[PDB]
Amino acid sequence: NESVYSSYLDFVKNSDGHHNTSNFMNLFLNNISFWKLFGFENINFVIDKYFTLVGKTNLGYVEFICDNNKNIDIYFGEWKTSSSKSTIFSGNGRNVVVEPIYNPDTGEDISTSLDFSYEPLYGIDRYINKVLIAPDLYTSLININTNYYSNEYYPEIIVLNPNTFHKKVNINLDSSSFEYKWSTEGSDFILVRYLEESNKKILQKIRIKGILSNTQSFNKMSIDFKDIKKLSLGYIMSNFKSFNSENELDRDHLGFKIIDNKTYYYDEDSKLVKGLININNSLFYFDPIESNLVTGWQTINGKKYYFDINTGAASTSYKIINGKHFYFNNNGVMQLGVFKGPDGFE
């Protein structure tokens, strides 16, 4: 329900990347004390292939499903803000498509506004790929509530080019203008707001798709900041500082990449995986910041894991580290006590 899902989102965010493998749900069940459902504490809960967790939000719901690799990711999600409906699937990547809500019984007047905020993306922001805003031909104003600093990941917001009858379409960002820089890749505009809010390196990207294709679209969008308003794209390009937007990590891959000297994994959606995830029947950890493989000792939420120097996989049994001896269970967690390695019970 709303309260339990809010607590679950707090647990997911407070985790140190342990948020997508199947063992994560066992950790959550321990946290929520699901063993009290039966009465005894030694219950081993099995998170199987088709495990589904549906969490209700004050606006809508998000359904996560477990994969063939025993990984939990968003299978579906839908939330409505009385003016904009946001829907995420798994076949279109993990993309939140935000579209104006098509009111039935079209005899009534059709709204022109289309708002977006990072509030519903709390906790699940680590599963989202990108935000695709898809204004229809009736959309005239787009409100981008960028003032939400209590998240960890800010997906790129893609504003699809509207084939509309409106002379101008207003993109109103609830933020200042000195924070934003701009860039272009191909025929897309890019606005990047980088700021330091409570010692957080917050970086929010808003690209407009195909907006540089023709002057019909270039002169159609008007940017509205909180301090300066009615700015055209040419005004942004001539007055705002410009940066270079192309990066190697934003390409499309399906496996392991060795970019520079850091290894990344692109899942089925051709997006970087983050945290402790199961790959090829093995457990790997990717930094919840840089999304790169880390090898050695990693303290995930207080539990120590060891990841191989060479292959990066997690140790899942008796292991020898620098001559010393350590024991890990099948989940990769370091263990304390007397356990049987090949030499005996150490």
Partner 1 sequence: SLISKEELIKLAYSIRPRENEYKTILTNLDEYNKLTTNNNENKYLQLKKLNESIDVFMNKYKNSSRNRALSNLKKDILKEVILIKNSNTSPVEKNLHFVWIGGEVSDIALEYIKQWADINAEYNIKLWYDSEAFLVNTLKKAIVESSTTEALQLLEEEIQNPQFDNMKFYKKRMEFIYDRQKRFINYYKSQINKPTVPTIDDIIKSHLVSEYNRDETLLESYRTNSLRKINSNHGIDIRANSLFTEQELLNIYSQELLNRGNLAAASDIVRLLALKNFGGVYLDVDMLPGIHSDLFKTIPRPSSIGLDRWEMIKLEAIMKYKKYINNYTSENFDKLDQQLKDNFKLIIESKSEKSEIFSKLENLNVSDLEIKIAFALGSVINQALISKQGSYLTNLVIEQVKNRYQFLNQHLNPAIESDNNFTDTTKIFHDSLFNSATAENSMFLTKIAPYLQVGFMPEARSTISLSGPGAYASAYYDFINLQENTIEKTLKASDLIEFKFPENNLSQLTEQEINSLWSFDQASAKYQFEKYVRDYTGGSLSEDNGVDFNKNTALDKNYLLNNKIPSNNVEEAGSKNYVHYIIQLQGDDISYEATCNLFSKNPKNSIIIQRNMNESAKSYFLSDDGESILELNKYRIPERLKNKEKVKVTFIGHGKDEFNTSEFARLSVDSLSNEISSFLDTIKLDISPKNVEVNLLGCNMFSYDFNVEETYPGKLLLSIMDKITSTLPDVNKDSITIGANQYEVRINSEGRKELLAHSGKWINKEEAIMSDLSSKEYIFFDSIDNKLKAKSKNIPGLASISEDIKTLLLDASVSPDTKFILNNLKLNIESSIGDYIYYEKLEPVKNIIHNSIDDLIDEFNLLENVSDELYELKKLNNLDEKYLISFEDISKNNSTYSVRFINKSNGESVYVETEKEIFSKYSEHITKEISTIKNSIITDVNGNLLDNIQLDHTSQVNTLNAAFFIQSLIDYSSNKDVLNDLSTSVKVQLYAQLFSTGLNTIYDSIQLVNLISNAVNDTINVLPTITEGIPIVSTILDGINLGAAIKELLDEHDPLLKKELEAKVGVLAINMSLSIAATVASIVGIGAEVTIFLL
* Residue pointed to by tokens 């989202």: 128
Residue type, 261: N
Is the CB of residue 189 less than 8 Å from the CB of residue 208?
A: yes
Closer to partner 1 by Cβ: residue 202 or 249: 249
Minimum distance between the CB of residue 153 and partner 1, rounded to whole angstroms? 16
Is the CB of residue 326 less than 8 Å from the CB of residue 315?
A: yes
Closer to partner 1 by Cβ: residue 47 or 334: 47
β-pairing, 52-56 with 303-307? unpaired
Closer to partner 1 by Cβ: residue 259 or 320: 259
Output phi, psi for 201, to 5 deg: -85, 70
- What Å distances lie between residue 35 and 23, 42, 43, 99, CA to CA? 15, 8, 6, 42
Minimum distance between the CB of residue 107 and partner 1, rounded to whole angstroms? 5
Closer to partner 1 by Cβ: residue 133 or 333: 133
Minimum distance between the CB of residue 67 and partner 1, rounded to whole angstroms? 5
Closest by CA to 103, choosing from 89, 114, 87, is: 114
Is the CB of residue 64 less than 8 Å from the CB of residue 89?
A: no
Closest by CA to 97, choosing from 112, 74, 79, is: 79
Closer to partner 1 by Cβ: residue 167 or 324: 167
Closer to partner 1 by Cβ: residue 7 or 219: 219
Minimum distance between the CB of residue 89 and partner 1, rounded to whole angstroms? 5
Minimum distance between the CB of residue 335 and partner 1, rounded to whole angstroms? 31
Element (H, E) at 250: none
Element (H, E) at 274: none
State the Cα–Cα distance between residues 188 and 186, nearest whole angstrom.
Answer: 6
Closer to partner 1 by Cβ: residue 191 or 333: 191
Contacts 24+ apart (CB under 8 A), 32-39: 32/4, 32/7, 32/8
β-pairing, 303-307 with 296-300? antiparallel
Minimum distance between the CB of residue 268 and partner 1, rounded to whole angstroms? 4
Minimum distance between the CB of residue 109 and partner 1, rounded to whole angstroms? 4
